[PDB]
Amino acid sequence: GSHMDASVMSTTYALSAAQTEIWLAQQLYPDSPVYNIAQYTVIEGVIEPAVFEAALRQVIDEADTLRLQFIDSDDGLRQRIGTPAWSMPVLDLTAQADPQAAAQAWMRADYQQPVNLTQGPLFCYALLKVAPAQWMWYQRYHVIMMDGYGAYLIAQRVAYVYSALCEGTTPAECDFGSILQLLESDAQYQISAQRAQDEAYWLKHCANWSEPATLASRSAPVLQQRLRQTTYLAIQALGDAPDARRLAQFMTAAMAAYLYRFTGEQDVVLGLPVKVRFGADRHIPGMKSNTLPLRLTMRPGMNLSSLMQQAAQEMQSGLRHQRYPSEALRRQLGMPSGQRLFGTTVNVMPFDLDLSFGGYSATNHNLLNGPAEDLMLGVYWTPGSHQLRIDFDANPACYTPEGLGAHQRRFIRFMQVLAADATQPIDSIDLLD
Ligand SMILES: CCCCCCCC(=O)SCCNC(=O)CCNC(=O)[C@H](O)C(C)(C)COP(=O)(O)OP(=O)(O)OC[C@H]1O[C@@H](n2cnc3c(N)ncnc32)[C@H](O)[C@@H]1OP(=O)(O)O
Ligand SMILES: CC(=O)NCCSC(=O)[C@@H](N)CC(C)C
């Protein structure tokens, strides 16, 4: 034989369950950058690129998932903590006729590139000066090594380290754990009795399932990046003081009521993304998130409060078993592949969007949020703020931009009228054009 494969196997770790599903899904279309997540922080002040690069180096040392390198092997793909070659581009676009548009185009050209996992770079950090005392920190990752909460933790840590370095202070000891402990915990869960309990619960929950209700007229795999319809809204349109749990309950209830009013289906299956972070996993950047199948049963004449109680019940009974992958449940239920458990996902991310870099305020804004197989309702909300950002992310094959926009406007209106009177049956509101 040849020793190279043996040394590859002995110097690597197996992928986690979520990483395995990500890799299996990406292998079908290796030229599709739909598995990139991306955001950018607008900083209202002066950023020194050298101090920022120093902070980025420190955080890359602190979050070892940023140094994961992947290697092919007889066992598909494996990973180790390697030495990625990275750089921080600094682009001053203040002289351009449209500095904001130039920065948007730069980051779009970045996150549109295909990402080969065995060569990298799996992440990209760059600074874009869009105005005097207005900078942009652009972050991009592949979902195989990062999710939403991980990127949020990394942005917070980078902000803190930069603020500490600017005032010449030693940054406090980082709170992060190692990605290897996360991988070991996932490997232990994969052969755990907790996993058997979760599998039994999810097999009983969606035992006799139904094909998902959807606003699209066709089912198609995700190939292009999402079509995004973004709208901002005030919290009083909801009015329910909601927390993350009840905000997600209300969003899922509204989406299920809209799907029932548009399709007539009464057993609406939605997708609910969750962190799957308990204990030490709450302080380890990387990929850990899952999507739960949330069933909402519709009865004609039912109001919003009953739907919200249904959603609260489903979450209260299902979040205990959120470690079981939805793909493993789909395979275990005996469903033919291509048949999904849910079509419309409701991704509520109650992560703080505010940061402080060297005394200057800054705000986070998403560009990519993973693949959009059908419809994804992304709800960005800083806990406490009176504002919500609502993104309709759609598969370009199943939707067109203006149709998605009309659906979003009608859904916003229907949801506002729903929250106006939670006792009125959903079959009564007249909807829009
Ligand atoms: C570059 C930037 C790009 C952006 C990246 C985007 C990438 C992605 O697409 S990843 C998707 C990101 N989204 C998310 O992370 C999902 C966020 N949202 C959510 O998780 C849900 O909508 C939400 C808010 C309902 C979860 O609510 P939350 O209250 O936090 O629940 P969670 O912590 O998951 O679980 C709590 C429940 O766990 C259950 N549980 C059982 N055992 C335990 C235990 N030992 N410890 C804790 N909880 C336990 C309990 O029943 C508990 O409920 P409760 O304590 O109230 O009885
Ligand atoms: C919603 C779905 O099943 N398809 C996309 C999965 S994309 C991914 O790995 C995560 N970042 C998002 C979920 C699992 C929290």
DSSP state of 110: H
Spatial distance between the Cα atoms of 242 and 254, rounded to a whole number of angstroms = 15
β-partners of residue 107 are none
> Rounded CA gap, 85 and 316, in Å?
44
Q: Which of 80, 86, 40, 41 is nearest to 59 (CA)?
A: 86
β-sheet with 227-234: strand ranges across: 227-234, 387-394, 375-380, 344-349, 267-274, 290-297
CATH number, domain 180-420:
3.30.559.30
Determined by: X-ray
The closest of 131, 138, 126 to 94, measured between CA atoms, is 131
Report d(CA 215, CA 212) in Å as an integer: 10
Identify the residue whose C-alpha is closest to ligand 1 atom 25.
245
Q: Which ligand is nearest to the CA of 328?
A: 2
Rounded CA gap, 368 and 372, in Å?
Answer: 10
Q: Can you say whether the dihedral through the CA atoms of 201, 202, 206, 208 is positive or negative? A: negative
Distances (CA, A) of 247 to 139, 257, 269, 419: 27, 15, 18, 11
Secondary structure element (H or E) that encloses residue 290, with its range: strand 290-297
- Residue closest via CA to ligand 2's atom 1 equals 291
**What is the atom index within ligand 1 of the atom nearest the CA of 140?**
1
For residue 373, how far is its CA from the centre of ligand 2 (angstroms)? 10
What's the rounded Cα separation, in Å, for the pair 139 and 237?
32
Q: What resolution in angstroms, rounded to 1 decimal? A: 2.6
Strands 36-43 and 360-369: antiparallel
| Alpha-carbon span 9 to 18, nearest angstrom | 20
**What are the residue ranges of helices labelled H in 217-373?**
244-263, 304-318, 326-332
- How many angstroms separate the CA atoms of 377 and 272, rounded? 10
CA–centroid distance, 289 to ligand 2, in Å, is 7
Q: Which residues, other chains included, contact 299 with Cβ-Cβ below 8 Å and sequence gap of 6+? A: 266
| Dihedral angle sign, alpha carbons of residues 170, 171, 175, 178 | negative
